[PDB]
mmCIF file of N, CA and C and ligand atoms in Angstrom:
data_model
loop_
_atom_site.group_PDB
_atom_site.id
_atom_site.type_symbol
_atom_site.label_atom_id
_atom_site.label_comp_id
_atom_site.label_asym_id
_atom_site.label_seq_id
_atom_site.Cartn_x
_atom_site.Cartn_y
_atom_site.Cartn_z
ATOM 1 N N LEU A 1 -9.777 -2.645 10.748
ATOM 2 C CA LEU A 1 -8.956 -1.709 9.969
ATOM 3 C C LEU A 1 -7.709 -2.358 9.375
ATOM 4 N N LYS A 2 -7.562 -2.303 8.038
ATOM 5 C CA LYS A 2 -6.409 -2.891 7.384
ATOM 6 C C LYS A 2 -5.133 -2.068 7.570
ATOM 7 N N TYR A 3 -5.248 -0.745 7.824
ATOM 8 C CA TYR A 3 -4.051 0.082 7.976
ATOM 9 C C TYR A 3 -4.050 0.944 9.227
ATOM 10 N N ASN A 4 -2.867 1.374 9.607
ATOM 11 C CA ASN A 4 -2.657 2.250 10.736
ATOM 12 C C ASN A 4 -1.611 3.277 10.315
ATOM 13 N N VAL A 5 -1.477 4.365 11.081
ATOM 14 C CA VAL A 5 -0.498 5.415 10.830
ATOM 15 C C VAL A 5 0.904 4.821 10.710
ATOM 16 N N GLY A 6 1.629 5.209 9.669
ATOM 17 C CA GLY A 6 2.975 4.718 9.431
ATOM 18 C C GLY A 6 3.061 3.587 8.428
ATOM 19 N N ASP A 7 1.940 2.944 8.110
ATOM 20 C CA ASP A 7 1.913 1.893 7.111
ATOM 21 C C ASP A 7 2.216 2.414 5.695
ATOM 22 N N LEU A 8 3.040 1.671 4.964
ATOM 23 C CA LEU A 8 3.428 2.043 3.636
ATOM 24 C C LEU A 8 2.476 1.420 2.652
ATOM 25 N N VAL A 9 1.864 2.255 1.795
ATOM 26 C CA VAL A 9 0.920 1.753 0.813
ATOM 27 C C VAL A 9 1.209 2.335 -0.591
ATOM 28 N N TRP A 10 0.618 1.722 -1.610
ATOM 29 C CA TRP A 10 0.569 2.252 -2.953
ATOM 30 C C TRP A 10 -0.861 2.802 -3.024
ATOM 31 N N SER A 11 -1.043 4.013 -3.542
ATOM 32 C CA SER A 11 -2.409 4.512 -3.748
ATOM 33 C C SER A 11 -2.625 4.994 -5.126
ATOM 34 N N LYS A 12 -3.799 4.706 -5.633
ATOM 35 C CA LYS A 12 -4.207 5.056 -6.971
ATOM 36 C C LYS A 12 -5.089 6.304 -6.962
ATOM 37 N N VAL A 13 -4.601 7.380 -7.585
ATOM 38 C CA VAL A 13 -5.307 8.655 -7.793
ATOM 39 C C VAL A 13 -5.566 8.784 -9.303
ATOM 40 N N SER A 14 -6.776 9.211 -9.708
ATOM 41 C CA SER A 14 -7.094 9.345 -11.133
ATOM 42 C C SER A 14 -6.139 10.295 -11.857
ATOM 43 N N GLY A 15 -5.611 9.833 -12.983
ATOM 44 C CA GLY A 15 -4.654 10.601 -13.770
ATOM 45 C C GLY A 15 -3.211 10.420 -13.337
ATOM 46 N N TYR A 16 -2.964 9.456 -12.439
ATOM 47 C CA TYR A 16 -1.628 9.206 -11.939
ATOM 48 C C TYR A 16 -1.382 7.739 -11.875
ATOM 49 N N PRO A 17 -0.128 7.305 -12.032
ATOM 50 C CA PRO A 17 0.165 5.894 -11.786
ATOM 51 C C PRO A 17 0.013 5.587 -10.283
ATOM 52 N N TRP A 18 -0.031 4.308 -9.924
ATOM 53 C CA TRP A 18 0.006 3.852 -8.529
ATOM 54 C C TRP A 18 1.237 4.487 -7.858
ATOM 55 N N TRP A 19 1.022 5.157 -6.713
ATOM 56 C CA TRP A 19 2.078 5.979 -6.141
ATOM 57 C C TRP A 19 2.432 5.532 -4.741
ATOM 58 N N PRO A 20 3.730 5.581 -4.373
ATOM 59 C CA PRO A 20 4.118 5.194 -3.009
ATOM 60 C C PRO A 20 3.680 6.241 -1.985
ATOM 61 N N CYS A 21 3.050 5.783 -0.896
ATOM 62 C CA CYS A 21 2.670 6.710 0.156
ATOM 63 C C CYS A 21 2.701 6.071 1.562
ATOM 64 N N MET A 22 2.412 6.888 2.595
ATOM 65 C CA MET A 22 2.401 6.462 3.971
ATOM 66 C C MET A 22 1.076 6.915 4.576
ATOM 67 N N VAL A 23 0.344 5.982 5.211
ATOM 68 C CA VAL A 23 -0.891 6.294 5.911
ATOM 69 C C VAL A 23 -0.522 7.206 7.095
ATOM 70 N N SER A 24 -1.214 8.336 7.225
ATOM 71 C CA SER A 24 -0.890 9.299 8.265
ATOM 72 C C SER A 24 -2.138 10.030 8.724
ATOM 73 N N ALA A 25 -2.039 10.739 9.866
ATOM 74 C CA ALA A 25 -3.174 11.496 10.334
ATOM 75 C C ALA A 25 -3.258 12.746 9.499
ATOM 76 N N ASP A 26 -4.483 13.116 9.114
ATOM 77 C CA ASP A 26 -4.737 14.398 8.440
ATOM 78 C C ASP A 26 -4.434 15.467 9.499
ATOM 79 N N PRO A 27 -3.458 16.333 9.257
ATOM 80 C CA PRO A 27 -3.087 17.313 10.282
ATOM 81 C C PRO A 27 -4.151 18.367 10.597
ATOM 82 N N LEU A 28 -5.219 18.473 9.796
ATOM 83 C CA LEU A 28 -6.285 19.425 10.083
ATOM 84 C C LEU A 28 -7.441 18.736 10.830
ATOM 85 N N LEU A 29 -7.745 17.494 10.470
ATOM 86 C CA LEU A 29 -8.864 16.760 11.042
ATOM 87 C C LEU A 29 -8.497 15.839 12.203
ATOM 88 N N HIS A 30 -7.198 15.576 12.403
ATOM 89 C CA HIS A 30 -6.663 14.683 13.430
ATOM 90 C C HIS A 30 -7.209 13.273 13.328
ATOM 91 N N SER A 31 -7.349 12.780 12.116
ATOM 92 C CA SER A 31 -7.799 11.413 11.887
ATOM 93 C C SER A 31 -7.136 10.802 10.650
ATOM 94 N N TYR A 32 -6.855 9.499 10.693
ATOM 95 C CA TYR A 32 -6.220 8.814 9.568
ATOM 96 C C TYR A 32 -7.200 7.937 8.778
ATOM 97 N N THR A 33 -8.399 7.678 9.307
ATOM 98 C CA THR A 33 -9.393 6.841 8.651
ATOM 99 C C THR A 33 -10.805 7.318 8.964
ATOM 100 N N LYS A 34 -11.745 7.045 8.069
ATOM 101 C CA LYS A 34 -13.138 7.441 8.253
ATOM 102 C C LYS A 34 -14.076 6.711 7.257
ATOM 103 N N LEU A 35 -15.402 6.890 7.392
ATOM 104 C CA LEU A 35 -16.363 6.280 6.473
ATOM 105 C C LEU A 35 -17.025 7.343 5.584
ATOM 106 N N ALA A 36 -18.256 3.320 2.560
ATOM 107 C CA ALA A 36 -16.939 2.709 2.342
ATOM 108 C C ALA A 36 -15.820 3.473 3.072
ATOM 109 N N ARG A 37 -14.787 2.747 3.493
ATOM 110 C CA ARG A 37 -13.689 3.306 4.250
ATOM 111 C C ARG A 37 -12.637 4.047 3.433
ATOM 112 N N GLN A 38 -12.105 5.112 4.017
ATOM 113 C CA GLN A 38 -11.054 5.918 3.444
ATOM 114 C C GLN A 38 -9.906 6.017 4.421
ATOM 115 N N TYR A 39 -8.714 6.259 3.903
ATOM 116 C CA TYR A 39 -7.531 6.444 4.712
ATOM 117 C C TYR A 39 -6.804 7.657 4.187
ATOM 118 N N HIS A 40 -6.203 8.421 5.073
ATOM 119 C CA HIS A 40 -5.418 9.571 4.700
ATOM 120 C C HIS A 40 -4.004 9.106 4.453
ATOM 121 N N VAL A 41 -3.425 9.558 3.336
ATOM 122 C CA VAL A 41 -2.061 9.210 3.004
ATOM 123 C C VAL A 41 -1.281 10.462 2.647
ATOM 124 N N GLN A 42 0.024 10.404 2.828
ATOM 125 C CA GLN A 42 0.919 11.424 2.301
ATOM 126 C C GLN A 42 1.724 10.729 1.209
ATOM 127 N N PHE A 43 1.961 11.400 0.103
ATOM 128 C CA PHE A 43 2.680 10.831 -1.015
ATOM 129 C C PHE A 43 4.135 11.140 -0.898
ATOM 130 N N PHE A 44 4.984 10.108 -1.063
ATOM 131 C CA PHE A 44 6.418 10.338 -1.103
ATOM 132 C C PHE A 44 6.755 11.015 -2.452
ATOM 133 N N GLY A 45 7.759 11.874 -2.452
ATOM 134 C CA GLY A 45 8.163 12.577 -3.665
ATOM 135 C C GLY A 45 8.855 13.881 -3.341
ATOM 136 N N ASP A 46 8.800 14.854 -4.253
ATOM 137 C CA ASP A 46 9.441 16.151 -4.005
ATOM 138 C C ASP A 46 8.453 17.255 -3.518
ATOM 139 N N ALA A 47 7.153 16.941 -3.414
ATOM 140 C CA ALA A 47 6.187 17.921 -2.934
ATOM 141 C C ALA A 47 5.315 17.339 -1.824
ATOM 142 N N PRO A 48 4.821 18.181 -0.891
ATOM 143 C CA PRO A 48 3.987 17.651 0.192
ATOM 144 C C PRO A 48 2.540 17.431 -0.221
ATOM 145 N N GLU A 49 2.275 16.345 -0.939
ATOM 146 C CA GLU A 49 0.924 16.045 -1.376
ATOM 147 C C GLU A 49 0.290 15.033 -0.472
ATOM 148 N N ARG A 50 -0.983 15.226 -0.218
ATOM 149 C CA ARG A 50 -1.738 14.334 0.641
ATOM 150 C C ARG A 50 -3.134 14.133 0.107
ATOM 151 N N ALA A 51 -3.849 13.102 0.568
ATOM 152 C CA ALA A 51 -5.195 12.814 0.057
ATOM 153 C C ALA A 51 -5.924 11.762 0.888
ATOM 154 N N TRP A 52 -7.242 11.766 0.812
ATOM 155 C CA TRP A 52 -8.075 10.740 1.417
ATOM 156 C C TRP A 52 -8.355 9.767 0.281
ATOM 157 N N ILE A 53 -7.948 8.498 0.433
ATOM 158 C CA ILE A 53 -8.116 7.485 -0.604
ATOM 159 C C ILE A 53 -9.058 6.366 -0.127
ATOM 160 N N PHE A 54 -9.955 5.846 -0.997
ATOM 161 C CA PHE A 54 -10.798 4.698 -0.626
ATOM 162 C C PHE A 54 -9.911 3.448 -0.508
ATOM 163 N N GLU A 55 -10.243 2.538 0.419
ATOM 164 C CA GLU A 55 -9.469 1.322 0.650
ATOM 165 C C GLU A 55 -9.300 0.484 -0.620
ATOM 166 N N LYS A 56 -10.260 0.539 -1.566
ATOM 167 C CA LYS A 56 -10.123 -0.218 -2.818
ATOM 168 C C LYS A 56 -9.004 0.316 -3.710
ATOM 169 N N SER A 57 -8.594 1.578 -3.512
ATOM 170 C CA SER A 57 -7.526 2.236 -4.230
ATOM 171 C C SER A 57 -6.224 2.273 -3.433
ATOM 172 N N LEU A 58 -6.055 1.363 -2.473
ATOM 173 C CA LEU A 58 -4.856 1.229 -1.659
ATOM 174 C C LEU A 58 -4.464 -0.227 -1.609
ATOM 175 N N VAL A 59 -3.175 -0.484 -1.532
ATOM 176 C CA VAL A 59 -2.620 -1.819 -1.323
ATOM 177 C C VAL A 59 -1.325 -1.617 -0.568
ATOM 178 N N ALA A 60 -0.897 -2.611 0.195
ATOM 179 C CA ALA A 60 0.368 -2.546 0.930
ATOM 180 C C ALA A 60 1.542 -2.385 -0.030
ATOM 181 N N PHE A 61 2.548 -1.617 0.391
ATOM 182 C CA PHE A 61 3.788 -1.415 -0.329
ATOM 183 C C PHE A 61 4.818 -2.270 0.425
ATOM 184 N N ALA A 62 5.539 -3.170 -0.277
ATOM 185 C CA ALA A 62 6.572 -4.030 0.328
ATOM 186 C C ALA A 62 6.099 -4.836 1.554
ATOM 187 N N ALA A 63 -4.984 -9.014 -2.324
ATOM 188 C CA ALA A 63 -5.346 -7.677 -2.806
ATOM 189 C C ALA A 63 -4.181 -7.032 -3.574
ATOM 190 N N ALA A 64 -2.958 -7.144 -3.029
ATOM 191 C CA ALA A 64 -1.766 -6.615 -3.675
ATOM 192 C C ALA A 64 -1.481 -7.358 -4.974
ATOM 193 N N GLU A 65 -1.798 -8.657 -5.050
ATOM 194 C CA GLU A 65 -1.556 -9.438 -6.261
ATOM 195 C C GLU A 65 -2.540 -9.161 -7.388
ATOM 196 N N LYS A 66 -3.655 -8.456 -7.121
ATOM 197 C CA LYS A 66 -4.655 -8.200 -8.165
ATOM 198 C C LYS A 66 -4.459 -6.877 -8.911
ATOM 199 N N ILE A 67 -3.690 -5.935 -8.352
ATOM 200 C CA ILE A 67 -3.496 -4.650 -9.020
ATOM 201 C C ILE A 67 -2.414 -4.713 -10.101
ATOM 202 N N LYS A 68 -2.457 -3.782 -11.048
ATOM 203 C CA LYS A 68 -1.465 -3.705 -12.107
ATOM 204 C C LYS A 68 -0.565 -2.493 -11.843
ATOM 205 N N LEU A 69 0.644 -2.738 -11.368
ATOM 206 C CA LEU A 69 1.608 -1.685 -11.087
ATOM 207 C C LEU A 69 2.278 -1.229 -12.375
ATOM 208 N N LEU A 70 2.035 0.012 -12.790
ATOM 209 C CA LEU A 70 2.648 0.540 -14.011
ATOM 210 C C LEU A 70 3.451 1.803 -13.690
ATOM 211 N N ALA A 71 4.706 1.846 -14.107
ATOM 212 C CA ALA A 71 5.581 2.987 -13.848
ATOM 213 C C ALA A 71 5.429 4.050 -14.919
ATOM 214 N N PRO A 72 5.484 5.322 -14.537
ATOM 215 C CA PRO A 72 5.422 6.386 -15.546
ATOM 216 C C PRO A 72 6.683 6.415 -16.423
ATOM 217 N N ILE A 73 6.514 6.803 -17.697
ATOM 218 C CA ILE A 73 7.570 6.929 -18.709
ATOM 219 C C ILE A 73 7.951 8.412 -18.890
ATOM 220 N N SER A 74 6.932 9.323 -18.951
ATOM 221 C CA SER A 74 7.116 10.784 -19.074
ATOM 222 C C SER A 74 8.119 11.300 -18.047
ATOM 223 N N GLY A 75 9.223 11.857 -18.533
ATOM 224 C CA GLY A 75 10.339 12.377 -17.747
ATOM 225 C C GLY A 75 10.051 13.083 -16.437
ATOM 226 N N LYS A 76 9.240 14.151 -16.468
ATOM 227 C CA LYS A 76 8.934 14.959 -15.280
ATOM 228 C C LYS A 76 8.250 14.150 -14.149
ATOM 229 N N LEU A 77 7.161 13.463 -14.478
ATOM 230 C CA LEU A 77 6.452 12.649 -13.511
ATOM 231 C C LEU A 77 7.334 11.477 -13.066
ATOM 232 N N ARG A 78 8.102 10.876 -14.002
ATOM 233 C CA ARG A 78 8.961 9.765 -13.656
ATOM 234 C C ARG A 78 9.992 10.104 -12.625
ATOM 235 N N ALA A 79 10.670 11.256 -12.748
ATOM 236 C CA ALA A 79 11.674 11.641 -11.754
ATOM 237 C C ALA A 79 11.044 11.854 -10.369
ATOM 238 N N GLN A 80 9.835 12.437 -10.303
ATOM 239 C CA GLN A 80 9.148 12.622 -9.029
ATOM 240 C C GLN A 80 8.751 11.262 -8.453
ATOM 241 N N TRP A 81 8.245 10.365 -9.300
ATOM 242 C CA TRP A 81 7.867 9.024 -8.891
ATOM 243 C C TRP A 81 9.094 8.245 -8.372
ATOM 244 N N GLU A 82 10.242 8.388 -9.038
ATOM 245 C CA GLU A 82 11.477 7.718 -8.606
ATOM 246 C C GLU A 82 11.944 8.235 -7.259
ATOM 247 N N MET A 83 11.770 9.537 -7.003
ATOM 248 C CA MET A 83 12.110 10.128 -5.709
ATOM 249 C C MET A 83 11.222 9.543 -4.630
ATOM 250 N N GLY A 84 9.942 9.367 -4.932
ATOM 251 C CA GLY A 84 9.000 8.760 -4.011
ATOM 252 C C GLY A 84 9.370 7.322 -3.712
ATOM 253 N N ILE A 85 9.777 6.573 -4.734
ATOM 254 C CA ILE A 85 10.176 5.175 -4.567
ATOM 255 C C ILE A 85 11.410 5.059 -3.663
ATOM 256 N N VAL A 86 12.449 5.850 -3.912
ATOM 257 C CA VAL A 86 13.674 5.909 -3.088
ATOM 258 C C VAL A 86 13.310 6.184 -1.608
ATOM 259 N N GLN A 87 12.412 7.152 -1.364
ATOM 260 C CA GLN A 87 11.977 7.490 -0.014
ATOM 261 C C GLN A 87 11.164 6.381 0.594
ATOM 262 N N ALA A 88 10.210 5.765 -0.166
ATOM 263 C CA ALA A 88 9.414 4.683 0.414
ATOM 264 C C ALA A 88 10.303 3.468 0.706
ATOM 265 N N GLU A 89 11.361 3.226 -0.085
ATOM 266 C CA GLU A 89 12.247 2.100 0.160
ATOM 267 C C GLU A 89 13.020 2.355 1.451
ATOM 268 N N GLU A 90 13.590 3.572 1.636
ATOM 269 C CA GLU A 90 14.287 3.957 2.868
ATOM 270 C C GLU A 90 13.332 3.845 4.063
ATOM 271 N N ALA A 91 12.069 4.297 3.910
ATOM 272 C CA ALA A 91 11.087 4.170 4.991
ATOM 273 C C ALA A 91 10.772 2.711 5.304
ATOM 274 N N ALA A 92 10.768 1.846 4.287
ATOM 275 C CA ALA A 92 10.483 0.417 4.507
ATOM 276 C C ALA A 92 11.594 -0.277 5.321
ATOM 277 N N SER A 93 12.818 0.255 5.277
ATOM 278 C CA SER A 93 13.950 -0.298 6.008
ATOM 279 C C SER A 93 13.973 0.131 7.481
ATOM 280 N N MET A 94 13.073 1.061 7.901
ATOM 281 C CA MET A 94 12.987 1.596 9.262
ATOM 282 C C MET A 94 11.777 1.052 10.013
ATOM 283 N N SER A 95 11.763 1.232 11.336
ATOM 284 C CA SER A 95 10.611 0.851 12.147
ATOM 285 C C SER A 95 9.504 1.900 11.923
ATOM 286 N N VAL A 96 8.253 1.555 12.258
ATOM 287 C CA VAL A 96 7.123 2.474 12.149
ATOM 288 C C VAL A 96 7.375 3.819 12.833
ATOM 289 N N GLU A 97 7.923 3.798 14.069
ATOM 290 C CA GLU A 97 8.199 5.039 14.790
ATOM 291 C C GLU A 97 9.328 5.865 14.173
ATOM 292 N N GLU A 98 10.346 5.211 13.594
ATOM 293 C CA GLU A 98 11.441 5.954 12.960
ATOM 294 C C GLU A 98 10.940 6.606 11.672
ATOM 295 N N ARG A 99 10.056 5.912 10.904
ATOM 296 C CA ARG A 99 9.609 6.512 9.648
ATOM 297 C C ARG A 99 8.583 7.623 9.902
ATOM 298 N N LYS A 100 7.779 7.534 10.975
ATOM 299 C CA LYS A 100 6.856 8.617 11.324
ATOM 300 C C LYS A 100 7.641 9.881 11.661
ATOM 301 N N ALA A 101 8.740 9.749 12.422
ATOM 302 C CA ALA A 101 9.547 10.916 12.790
ATOM 303 C C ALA A 101 10.304 11.513 11.638
ATOM 304 N N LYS A 102 10.692 10.689 10.674
ATOM 305 C CA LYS A 102 11.452 11.173 9.540
ATOM 306 C C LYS A 102 10.602 11.690 8.370
ATOM 307 N N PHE A 103 9.407 11.117 8.120
ATOM 308 C CA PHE A 103 8.666 11.469 6.911
ATOM 309 C C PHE A 103 7.353 12.254 7.099
ATOM 310 N N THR A 104 6.829 12.357 8.320
ATOM 311 C CA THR A 104 5.563 13.063 8.546
ATOM 312 C C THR A 104 5.656 14.516 8.142
ATOM 313 N N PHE A 105 4.712 14.982 7.313
ATOM 314 C CA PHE A 105 4.703 16.382 6.896
ATOM 315 C C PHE A 105 4.478 17.303 8.068
ATOM 316 N N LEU A 106 4.975 18.527 7.949
ATOM 317 C CA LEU A 106 4.800 19.513 9.005
ATOM 318 C C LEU A 106 4.063 20.767 8.555
ATOM 319 N N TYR A 107 3.001 21.188 9.259
ATOM 320 C CA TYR A 107 2.371 22.482 8.959
ATOM 321 C C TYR A 107 3.200 23.549 9.647
ATOM 322 N N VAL A 108 3.668 24.533 8.901
ATOM 323 C CA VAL A 108 4.367 25.674 9.469
ATOM 324 C C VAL A 108 3.471 26.835 9.057
ATOM 325 N N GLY A 109 2.701 27.354 10.007
ATOM 326 C CA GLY A 109 1.667 28.327 9.696
ATOM 327 C C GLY A 109 0.541 27.597 8.984
ATOM 328 N N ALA A 110 0.125 28.108 7.829
ATOM 329 C CA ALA A 110 -0.864 27.495 6.939
ATOM 330 C C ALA A 110 -0.186 26.727 5.775
ATOM 331 N N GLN A 111 1.147 26.642 5.773
ATOM 332 C CA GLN A 111 1.927 26.001 4.730
ATOM 333 C C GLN A 111 2.300 24.571 5.067
ATOM 334 N N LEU A 112 1.859 23.599 4.251
ATOM 335 C CA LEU A 112 2.262 22.214 4.486
ATOM 336 C C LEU A 112 3.676 22.020 3.949
ATOM 337 N N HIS A 113 4.553 21.484 4.773
ATOM 338 C CA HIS A 113 5.942 21.284 4.408
ATOM 339 C C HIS A 113 6.308 19.830 4.440
ATOM 340 N N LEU A 114 7.348 19.476 3.682
ATOM 341 C CA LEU A 114 7.959 18.157 3.792
ATOM 342 C C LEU A 114 8.627 18.116 5.177
ATOM 343 N N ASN A 115 8.848 16.923 5.743
ATOM 344 C CA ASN A 115 9.560 16.826 7.019
ATOM 345 C C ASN A 115 10.979 17.407 6.818
ATOM 346 N N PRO A 116 11.381 18.362 7.666
ATOM 347 C CA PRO A 116 12.687 19.023 7.460
ATOM 348 C C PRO A 116 13.878 18.062 7.255
ATOM 349 N N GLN A 117 13.811 16.827 7.794
ATOM 350 C CA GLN A 117 14.862 15.829 7.571
ATOM 351 C C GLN A 117 14.933 15.477 6.080
ATOM 352 N N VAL A 118 13.764 15.287 5.452
ATOM 353 C CA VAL A 118 13.608 15.003 4.030
ATOM 354 C C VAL A 118 13.996 16.222 3.191
ATOM 355 N N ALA A 119 13.516 17.420 3.588
ATOM 356 C CA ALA A 119 13.824 18.667 2.890
ATOM 357 C C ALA A 119 15.351 18.912 2.835
ATOM 358 N N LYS A 120 16.075 18.588 3.921
ATOM 359 C CA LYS A 120 17.533 18.731 3.958
ATOM 360 C C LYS A 120 18.210 17.541 3.260
HETATM 361 C C1 LIG B 201 -0.154 10.622 -7.152
HETATM 362 C C2 LIG B 201 0.773 11.425 -6.273
HETATM 363 N N1 LIG B 201 1.097 12.780 -6.748
HETATM 364 C C3 LIG B 201 2.374 12.939 -7.445
HETATM 365 C C4 LIG B 201 3.462 13.562 -6.602
HETATM 366 C C5 LIG B 201 3.465 13.438 -5.223
HETATM 367 C C6 LIG B 201 4.483 14.022 -4.494
HETATM 368 N N2 LIG B 201 5.485 14.714 -5.049
HETATM 369 C C7 LIG B 201 5.472 14.825 -6.382
HETATM 370 C C8 LIG B 201 4.494 14.273 -7.185
HETATM 371 C C9 LIG B 201 0.226 13.842 -6.607
HETATM 372 C C10 LIG B 201 -0.971 13.736 -5.909
HETATM 373 C C11 LIG B 201 -1.781 14.860 -5.826
HETATM 374 C C12 LIG B 201 -3.088 14.831 -5.090
HETATM 375 N N3 LIG B 201 -1.436 16.030 -6.394
HETATM 376 C C13 LIG B 201 -0.256 16.029 -7.051
HETATM 377 N N4 LIG B 201 0.140 17.206 -7.653
HETATM 378 C C14 LIG B 201 -0.791 18.299 -7.968
HETATM 379 C C15 LIG B 201 0.098 19.377 -8.526
HETATM 380 C C16 LIG B 201 1.128 18.591 -9.303
HETATM 381 C C17 LIG B 201 1.368 17.327 -8.462
HETATM 382 C C18 LIG B 201 2.681 17.334 -7.668
HETATM 383 N N5 LIG B 201 2.922 18.585 -6.960
HETATM 384 C C19 LIG B 201 3.897 19.430 -7.336
HETATM 385 N N6 LIG B 201 4.059 20.515 -6.572
HETATM 386 O O1 LIG B 201 4.600 19.208 -8.336
HETATM 387 N N7 LIG B 201 0.585 14.989 -7.181
#
Protein backbone atom coordinates (compact mmCIF):
# COMPACT_ATOMS: atom_id res chain seq x y z
CA LEU A 1 0.00 0.00 0.00
CA LYS A 2 1.40 3.37 -1.10
CA TYR A 3 -0.83 5.37 1.30
CA ASN A 4 -2.25 5.27 4.80
CA VAL A 5 -4.78 7.40 6.73
CA GLY A 6 -3.47 10.95 7.21
CA ASP A 7 -1.30 11.00 4.09
CA LEU A 8 -1.53 14.18 2.04
CA VAL A 9 -2.20 13.63 -1.65
CA TRP A 10 -3.24 15.48 -4.82
CA SER A 11 -6.22 13.75 -6.48
CA LYS A 12 -7.57 14.11 -9.94
CA VAL A 13 -11.41 14.12 -10.34
CA SER A 14 -12.91 14.57 -13.85
CA GLY A 15 -13.89 18.20 -14.47
CA TYR A 16 -11.61 19.50 -11.73
CA PRO A 17 -7.98 20.48 -11.46
CA TRP A 18 -5.63 18.29 -9.33
CA TRP A 19 -6.89 18.95 -5.80
CA PRO A 20 -5.26 18.81 -2.35
CA CYS A 21 -6.65 16.06 -0.13
CA MET A 22 -5.99 13.71 2.82
CA VAL A 23 -6.35 9.90 2.68
CA SER A 24 -8.94 8.99 5.33
CA ALA A 25 -11.33 6.24 6.37
CA ASP A 26 -14.73 6.37 4.68
CA PRO A 27 -16.92 7.08 7.73
CA LEU A 28 -19.73 4.82 6.42
CA LEU A 29 -17.64 1.83 5.26
CA HIS A 30 -14.82 2.06 7.87
CA SER A 31 -12.13 1.56 5.25
CA TYR A 32 -9.55 3.81 3.54
CA THR A 33 -8.51 1.45 0.69
CA LYS A 34 -10.02 -1.34 -1.43
CA LEU A 35 -9.88 -3.17 -4.83
CA ALA A 36 -7.10 -1.82 -9.37
CA ARG A 37 -6.67 -0.11 -5.98
CA GLN A 38 -8.67 2.83 -4.68
CA TYR A 39 -8.20 5.11 -1.69
CA HIS A 40 -10.72 7.25 0.12
CA VAL A 41 -9.80 10.91 0.37
CA GLN A 42 -11.33 14.04 1.84
CA PHE A 43 -10.77 17.24 -0.13
CA PHE A 44 -9.43 20.31 1.61
CA GLY A 45 -11.51 23.45 0.92
CA ASP A 46 -14.70 25.14 2.14
CA ALA A 47 -17.03 22.09 1.76
CA PRO A 48 -16.88 18.52 3.14
CA GLU A 49 -16.25 16.65 -0.11
CA ARG A 50 -14.97 13.13 -0.22
CA ALA A 51 -14.39 10.41 -2.83
CA TRP A 52 -12.89 7.02 -3.68
CA ILE A 53 -10.02 7.69 -6.13
CA PHE A 54 -7.96 5.13 -8.19
CA GLU A 55 -4.23 5.10 -7.24
CA LYS A 56 -3.34 6.28 -10.80
CA SER A 57 -5.28 9.51 -10.05
CA LEU A 58 -3.36 10.16 -6.79
CA VAL A 59 0.14 11.44 -6.07
CA ALA A 60 1.83 12.57 -2.85
CA PHE A 61 1.38 16.22 -1.86
CA ALA A 62 4.63 17.83 -0.49
CA ALA A 63 4.96 9.26 -10.07
CA ALA A 64 4.67 12.83 -8.69
CA GLU A 65 7.11 14.07 -11.38
CA LYS A 66 4.95 12.72 -14.26
CA ILE A 67 1.69 14.60 -13.53
CA LYS A 68 0.85 18.09 -14.81
CA LEU A 69 -0.24 20.32 -11.91
CA LEU A 70 -2.52 23.07 -13.27
CA ALA A 71 -4.17 25.71 -11.05
CA PRO A 72 -7.70 26.95 -11.74
CA ILE A 73 -8.13 30.53 -13.11
CA SER A 74 -12.00 30.85 -12.74
CA GLY A 75 -12.61 32.98 -9.61
CA LYS A 76 -15.11 30.79 -7.70
CA LEU A 77 -13.24 27.47 -8.06
CA ARG A 78 -9.89 29.25 -7.56
CA ALA A 79 -10.82 30.68 -4.16
CA GLN A 80 -12.01 27.22 -2.98
CA TRP A 81 -8.82 25.63 -4.37
CA GLU A 82 -6.68 28.29 -2.58
CA MET A 83 -8.49 27.52 0.70
CA GLY A 84 -7.68 23.84 0.17
CA ILE A 85 -4.02 24.66 -0.52
CA VAL A 86 -3.72 26.83 2.67
CA GLN A 87 -5.25 23.93 4.71
CA ALA A 88 -3.09 21.23 3.08
CA GLU A 89 0.03 23.38 3.73
CA GLU A 90 -0.94 23.80 7.44
CA ALA A 91 -1.62 20.02 7.60
CA ALA A 92 1.80 19.31 6.01
CA SER A 93 3.49 21.25 8.86
CA MET A 94 1.85 18.90 11.49
CA SER A 95 2.38 15.26 12.47
CA VAL A 96 0.00 12.59 11.06
CA GLU A 97 -1.88 12.35 14.39
CA GLU A 98 -2.24 16.14 14.77
CA ARG A 99 -3.63 16.53 11.22
CA LYS A 100 -6.08 13.60 11.68
CA ALA A 101 -7.48 15.31 14.81
CA LYS A 102 -7.70 18.70 13.18
CA PHE A 103 -8.97 17.89 9.64
CA THR A 104 -11.03 14.63 9.76
CA PHE A 105 -14.64 15.25 8.74
CA LEU A 106 -17.36 14.57 11.26
CA TYR A 107 -20.80 12.97 10.67
CA VAL A 108 -23.34 14.74 12.86
CA GLY A 109 -26.50 12.72 12.28
CA ALA A 110 -26.65 12.05 8.51
CA GLN A 111 -24.83 15.38 7.77
CA LEU A 112 -21.14 15.31 6.86
CA HIS A 113 -19.39 18.27 8.47
CA LEU A 114 -15.98 19.87 8.27
CA ASN A 115 -13.91 19.25 11.45
CA PRO A 116 -15.24 21.86 13.93
CA GLN A 117 -11.64 23.19 14.40
CA VAL A 118 -11.59 24.00 10.64
CA ALA A 119 -15.22 25.27 10.67
CA LYS A 120 -14.28 27.75 13.47
C1 LIG B 1 -12.02 18.26 -6.70
C2 LIG B 1 -12.46 18.64 -5.31
N1 LIG B 1 -13.75 19.34 -5.21
C3 LIG B 1 -13.70 20.80 -5.09
C4 LIG B 1 -13.93 21.31 -3.69
C5 LIG B 1 -13.64 20.54 -2.58
C6 LIG B 1 -13.87 21.05 -1.32
N2 LIG B 1 -14.37 22.27 -1.10
C7 LIG B 1 -14.65 23.01 -2.18
C8 LIG B 1 -14.45 22.57 -3.47
C9 LIG B 1 -14.96 18.68 -5.30
C10 LIG B 1 -15.05 17.30 -5.36
C11 LIG B 1 -16.31 16.73 -5.45
C12 LIG B 1 -16.49 15.24 -5.52
N3 LIG B 1 -17.43 17.47 -5.46
C13 LIG B 1 -17.24 18.81 -5.40
N4 LIG B 1 -18.36 19.61 -5.42
C14 LIG B 1 -19.67 19.16 -5.90
C15 LIG B 1 -20.57 20.34 -5.65
C16 LIG B 1 -19.67 21.51 -5.94
C17 LIG B 1 -18.29 21.09 -5.42
C18 LIG B 1 -17.89 21.74 -4.09
N5 LIG B 1 -18.95 21.70 -3.09
C19 LIG B 1 -19.58 22.82 -2.70
N6 LIG B 1 -20.49 22.67 -1.73
O1 LIG B 1 -19.33 23.92 -3.21
N7 LIG B 1 -16.06 19.44 -5.32
